[PDB]
């Protein structure tokens with residue numbers, strides 16, 4: 001995997017965890033950015049797990 005793919009893969013695994021799934025979106029977004037994910041990478045991970053968010057929602061959290 002590329003480093004980007006590893007970031008997204010790690011985010012996917014995170015977002016699937018049952019406790020995580022009960023955490024609000026905002027805190028997960030801020031978490032994922034702290035891990036070094038861009039907004040686009042975060043948006044990709046949310047879509048890969050079937051919890052899709054707009055880019056604009058993600059950028060509003062991060063703003």
Ligand SMILES: COc1ccc(CN2CCc3c(c(C(=O)N[C@@H](CC(=O)O)c4ccccc4)nn3CCO)C2)c2ccccc12
Pocket residue numbers: 007010011013014017019020023027028031032035
């Ligand atoms: C912001 O909210 C939270 C952050 C962290 C944790 C603890 N872990 C929950 C489960 C979890 C974590 C991580 C995690 O931190 N992964 C890192 C990579 C690593 O350390 O192996 C990571 C890196 C980059 C992007 C996302 C995740 N992965 N997973 C799933 C696999 O066990 C972190 C939470 C636990 C419960 C509820 C909310 C949590």
